[PDB]
Nucleic acid binder design. Structure first.
Ligand SMILES: [K+]
Ligand SMILES: [K+]
Ligand SMILES: [K+]
Ligand SMILES: [Mg+2]
Ligand SMILES: [Mg+2]
Ligand SMILES: [Mg+2]
Ligand SMILES: [Mg+2]
Ligand SMILES: [Mg+2]
Ligand SMILES: [Mg+2]
Ligand SMILES: [Mg+2]
Ligand SMILES: [Mg+2]
Ligand SMILES: [Mg+2]
Ligand SMILES: [Mg+2]
Ligand SMILES: [Mg+2]
Ligand SMILES: [Mg+2]
Ligand SMILES: [Mg+2]
Ligand SMILES: [Mg+2]
Ligand SMILES: [Mg+2]
Ligand SMILES: [Mg+2]
Ligand SMILES: [Mg+2]
Lengths: 98, 60, 95, 283, 290, 128
RNA sequence: CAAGGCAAAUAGGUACAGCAGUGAGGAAUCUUGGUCAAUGGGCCCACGCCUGAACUGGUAACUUGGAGGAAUGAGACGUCGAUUUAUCGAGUAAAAUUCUGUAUACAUAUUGAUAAUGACAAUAUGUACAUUUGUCUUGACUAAUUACGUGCCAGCAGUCGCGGCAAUACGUAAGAGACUAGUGUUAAUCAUCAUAAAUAGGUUUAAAGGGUACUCAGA
RNA sequence: AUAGAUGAGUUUGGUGAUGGCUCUGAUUGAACACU
């Protein structure tokens, strides 16, 4: 079962993730089939900006990710959300309005 | 670019260096990445990129 | 620096001197450092191949500095120029 | 009781070293004194290091008022006053900060500026141009060009700089292309033909002015192409920036310097000596 | 904690030259021997002497183990080329003769005839030796704590370091708390004005202020660290030089790291109070730390 | 040697050189614990003269070696557990090992002021 | 299925080379913690449950990186150490004065995470504090000296070596050289070593030409 | 990646060679001693 998931890398209190295409039943950090992108959870701030806004830098190969989703790849709950923001899949969870 | 580059950053006035004016030695990066496989043959146009390939394997 | 490479042998003591680009320094032994530093040489490399006799190493080194290939004589012998690329590139010798 | 060593110190410090207590005369007052080139030497044992002049407080304004108001290209201002293009760009950046401080009603260090500027030699630009500030045609000594090569060629060959570049290497360029203001060569080639002076200046401005447009056009398309690969999706809290990249550019064996990812087959180098852990670039 | 190596920083017996504006340092610098004795000393004894002399000044606050890896055998240099020569000649005349150039008569024959020979075609000032030896300690000029001391913002390399560690410097408009940050060509480091005035200002001894407040020009303010009105240090004129690689602005106390120190034919840009003979021996030591 | 002679494997490794402390060099150990079997005196060689304090120790591995007792005065005797380290007494044949003075049973020189680390002696603790 | 160890009797289990931990061996290597909040996996229509993987806290200078304080400081006409008794040092060193607020402590905010869920911590800002020296070396190689004691004795030593009554080499005292929260020693690896030489060696007298050349294989 | 190639002590009445040993450089998942 192919899956688009995250591989945690980095140091203590410094998480850094790697979007990968790996079989479900394999180690989390084993060499996958491909590395689609990277993900950084800790949000950053622009250098010369004082508005206080924050952003999350994400590198993603949308072209390669779309092909694997079309053949039956199952993205995890975390990667599903990211793909939704880009506009590839529909949101899995939404804030209840009532 | 919502915030204009202030005069503090070095990108305020860009003056490119002339060719072959530096010899910075990049350190050898250790490690490798998994070579992404190839989806098409090396020669010829495959059938996957034709008119109705997707509509033939994933019909409604 | 010296002209090209030189190799002299004095009774089992072979010395090999090499010309190095500017800024290389005197990456040589202690005895070769004194001679080069006293003659005016600033960039050079030397190796003792066979023996390291304190005496014959000096006789060989001093004999190698006097056996440098003269570029002007080599040119007249072959009938061809021996243009030094570094002098034409910068339009004059850069000491 | 003071020791003899201290006694000899204060004595020297009261008669010979007293001229350095307070700065009365304008200009350098170093120990090495003036050299054969008219430049003060701070350390007598090192005759090579000299106290080079610094742009005057007014000269900095002349450069600023020229690039901003008159809108002349930095290359023309550099060649006009013989100031390095890297220095002209820095003077404008520092001057822009002054305008900010003066605009924000911040107290300038005028007492520290006037007192220090009297200790350093200066070169006022404009009318009184006694000497050029520095060398604007300094070329980097490429390691390939440092080799001693005596190439055998025919007795009657016209060995030019182009031929010398190929001898050092096939990818090396001659010194005619490594200049920061390569338009000066073309300007000098017009004088050899006895072209009217101020007409050659006209071509120089157009040449330099046109060269800046090309540079500004290149960086414009670049920055425009860098933001086209970023997809900014606004959310409740943050703004996610999805950057696109070809994941297949990992070389022929997976090893590539410009590849994106955390390399799998590497352990932590934190225990290695000389492992720099400081920010390398404040962007 | 004062280590055993700082016990006699400004000794008048050893006579070490330190990177500071102390009056004791000014005496050791002014009365330094013109020529160190290397007559009977061996090669190791020569290298050790030069190492101790140069290290007392260059990066004195840097561990010997750290500088050994910082040392670079690559010494940057540049060559000046005027466009006038480039336009007229293309470098062919330099190869005339047999490749090296057209030979000229010896010196004992030229003036013998009242007429001098025609000038040799070449760039102006194209026979001066370039001082590569003085660039041995160039990498140290890239640190953030050294650059502040070379811009006349601090009275010492140590005092310049605290400005960085204590969060008073701002590189590229961003706080930098690392005195080891290697400045890049184009970086703009800015020190706090209040700390620059105290470092370079004169000492504030209150006994003289007793009869100062009662009995453009500045006003007397008794609520500031430096002595008011601000005046330069007692011996700042003897160490008042700014290197050509740095462009400074005294008003806002900001400077720019234009480029790295490069050796030019006839001069160097690394401030070093030592002759090429000593800088040469220091270079040889660090080649193999022996 | 011709190229064909090098194909057949003529470049064999140089003969091994006996280590200074084979008992330690063999198992890649910096030190070894042992029980003293005899504490005596050894006579130096031709040029030197005197009496070197040596101890016949049986290492944990099983081998019996002759170690050297550095310093002035020792408190070890038969059936004493002492630590052994590499070295050698250059003027005593067979003595190819030393004994750490701050070891388990061997005590460091009490009246030592110079190079205390070499002899396992604590600081005098006078002003402390 | 069989055997031995442990356990078991009419039983027929167990093997911690799963995590933490104990004993043993050894010169020598850790906590019988918290949580599934993050990431990954298994089951599940869904909700959800489980996860000693994993994420986090703890221990150990084992290693690396950083901090561990800067400026002023001249007659306290004091103190000490030597010794030519008046010369040379400790010494800008100290005290003292003027500033900073680094590790860190506390406080606030943000953040790791969002549909929701925070075990624990990071980051930013504000205020506040100026806290140790230690170790080796000193004949040459190899940077750095005298005095006293001992007298081929006691001891030093990586190599050569030192000590036999006026020892710069041993043991003390002082000075000097150097590294520094590390410093030496021991063990090991690479290089030094062209010191197994493919690149690139050599074999008359120094390690090394076979007793001989016809000759298959092979060059 | 174009700067990267280095020696020193020790055999002899003495000289020049041959030839080992040790030192100088870097390091360890290290141990011990003094801290
Ligand atoms: K030899
Ligand atoms: K011997
Ligand atoms: K024979
Ligand atoms: Mg002592
Ligand atoms: Mg078991
Ligand atoms: Mg276990
Ligand atoms: Mg045990
Ligand atoms: Mg979980
Ligand atoms: Mg959960
Ligand atoms: Mg999950
Ligand atoms: Mg579910
Ligand atoms: Mg703090
Ligand atoms: Mg010595
Ligand atoms: Mg000793
Ligand atoms: Mg001998
Ligand atoms: Mg002694
Ligand atoms: Mg440390
Ligand atoms: Mg036979
Ligand atoms: Mg025979
Ligand atoms: Mg004989």
């Amino acid at each position: 079962v192919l899956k688009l998931r995250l591989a945690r890398f980095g140091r203590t209190n410094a998480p850094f993730y790697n979007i990968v295409v790996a079989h479900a039943r394999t180690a989390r950090n084993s060499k996958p089939l491909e590395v689609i992108g990277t993900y950084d959870p800790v949000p950053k701030k622009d250098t010369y900006d004082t508005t206080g806004k924050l952003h999350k830098d994400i590198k993603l190969d949308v072209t390669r990710a779309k092909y694997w989703i079309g053949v039956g790849a199952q993205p995890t709950d975390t990667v599903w959300r990211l793909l939704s923001l880009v506009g590839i899949l529909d949101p899995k969870y939404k804030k209840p309005q009532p | 670019d919502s915030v204009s580059i202030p005069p503090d950053s070095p990108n305020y006035i860009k003056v490119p260096e002339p060719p072959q004016s530096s010899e910075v030695r990049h350190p050898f990066v250790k490690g490798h990445l998994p070579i992404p496989r190839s989806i098409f043959p090396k020669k010829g146009v495959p059938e996957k990129v034709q008119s109705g390939y997707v509509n033939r394997i994933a019909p409604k | 620096t010296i002209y090209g490479e030189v190799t002299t042998k004095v009774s089992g003591t072979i010395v090999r001197l090499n010309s190095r680009p500017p800024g290389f320094g005197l990456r040589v032994s202690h005895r070769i450092f004194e001679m080069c530093r006293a003659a005016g040489i600033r960039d050079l490399s030397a190796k003792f191949l066979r023996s390291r006799n304190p005496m014959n190493t000096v006789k060989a080194t001093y004999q190698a500095l006097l056996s440098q290939p003269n570029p002007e004589d080599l040119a007249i012998g072959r009938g061809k120029k021996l243009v030094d690329v570094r002098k034409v590139y910068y339009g004059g010798s850069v000491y | 009781v003071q020791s003899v060593r201290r006694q000899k110190m204060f004595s020297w410090l009261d008669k010979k070293g007293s001229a350095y207590k307070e700065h009365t005369r304008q200009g350098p007052n170093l120990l090495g004194g003036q050299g054969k080139d008219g430049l003060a030497v701070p350390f007598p044992n090192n005759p090579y290091f000299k106290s080079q002049p610094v742009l005057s407080e007014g000269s900095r304004e002349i450069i600023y008022q020229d690039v901003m108001e008159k809108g002349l290209p930095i290359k023309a201002v550099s060649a006009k006053y013989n100031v390095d293009v890297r220095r002209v760009a820095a003077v404008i950046r520092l001057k822009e900060i002054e305008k900010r401080w003066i605009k924000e009603y911040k107290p300038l260090a005028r007492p520290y500026a006037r007192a220090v500027m009297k200790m350093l030699p200066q070169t006022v630009l404009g009318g009184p141009d006694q000497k050029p500030h520095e060398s604007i045609n300094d070329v980097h000594v490429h390691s390939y060009t440092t080799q001693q090569l005596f190439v055998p060629v025919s007795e009657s060959r016209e060995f030019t700089r182009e031929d010398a570049a190929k001898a050092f290497g096939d990818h090396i360029l001659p010194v005619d292309k490594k200049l920061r203001v390569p338009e000066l060569i073309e300007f000098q080639k017009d004088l050899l033909k006895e072209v009217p002076l101020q007409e050659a200046n006209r071509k120089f401005l157009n040449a330099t002015a046109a060269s800046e447009a090309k540079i500004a056009e290149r960086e414009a398309k670049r920055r425009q192409a860098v933001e086209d690969a970023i997809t900014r999706v606004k959310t409740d809290r943050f703004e996610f920036r999805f950057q696109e990249f070809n994941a297949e550019n990992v070389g022929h064996d997976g090893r590539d310097r410009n590849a994106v990812g955390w390399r799998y087959g590497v352990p932590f180098p934190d225990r290695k000596r000389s492992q720099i852990k400081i920010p390398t670039k404040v962007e | 904690m004062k280590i055993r190596r700082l016990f006699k920083y400004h000794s008048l017996k050893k006579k070490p030259i330190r990177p500071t504006w102390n009056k004791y340092n000014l005496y050791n610098l002014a009365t330094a021997g013109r020529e160190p004795r290397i007559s009977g000393k061996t090669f190791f004894q020569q290298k050790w002497l030069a190492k101790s002399l140069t290290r007392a000044y260059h990066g004195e606050h840097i561990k010997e183990r750290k500088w050994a890896r910082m040392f670079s055998r690559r010494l940057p240099a540049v060559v000046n080329m005027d466009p006038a020569y480039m336009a007229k000649y293309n470098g062919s005349e330099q190869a005339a003769g047999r490749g090296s150039g057209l030979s000229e008569p010896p010196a004992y024959e030229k003036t013998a005839d009242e007429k001098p020979a025609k000038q040799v075609i070449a760039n102006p000032g194209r026979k001066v030796p370039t001082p590569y030896e003085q660039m041995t300690f160039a990498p140290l000029e890239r640190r953030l704590d050294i650059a502040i001391f070379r811009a006349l913002f601090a009275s010492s390399a140590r005092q310049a370091r605290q400005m960085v560690v204590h969060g008073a410097v701002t590189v590229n408009g961003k706080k930098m708390k690392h005195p080891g940050y290697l400045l890049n060509p184009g970086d703009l480091f800015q020190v706090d004005v209040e700390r620059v005035l105290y470092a370079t200002g004169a000492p504030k001894d209150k006994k003289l202020l007793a009869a100062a407040m009662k009995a453009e020009d500045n006003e007397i303010d008794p609520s500031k660290p430096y002595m008011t009105p601000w005046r330069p240090r007692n011996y700042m004129s003897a160490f008042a030089f700014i290197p050509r690689y740095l462009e400074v602005n005294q008003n806002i106390c900001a400077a720019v790291y234009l480029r790295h120190p490069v050796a030019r034919p006839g001069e160097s840009e690394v401030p070093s109070p030592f002759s090429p003979t000593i800088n040469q021996l220091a270079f040889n030591w660090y080649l193999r730390r022996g | 040697a011709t190229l064909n002679q090098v194909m057949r494997g003529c470049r064999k490794p140089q003969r091994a050189r006996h280590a200074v402390s084979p008992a330690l060099s063999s198992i890649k150990s910096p030190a070894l614990k042992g029980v003293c079997v005899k504490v005596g005196i050894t006579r130096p060689k031709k040029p030197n003269s005197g009496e070197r304090k040596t101890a016949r120790v049986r290492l944990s591995t099983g081998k019996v070696i002759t170690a050297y007792i550095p310093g002035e005065g020792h408190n070890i005797s038969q059936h004493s557990v002492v630590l052994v380290r590499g070295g050698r007494a250059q003027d005593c044949p067979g003595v190819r090992y030393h004994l750490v003075r701050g070891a388990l049973d061997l005590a460091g020189v009490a009246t030592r002021m110079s190079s205390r680390s070499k002899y396992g002696t604590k600081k005098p603790k006078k002003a402390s």
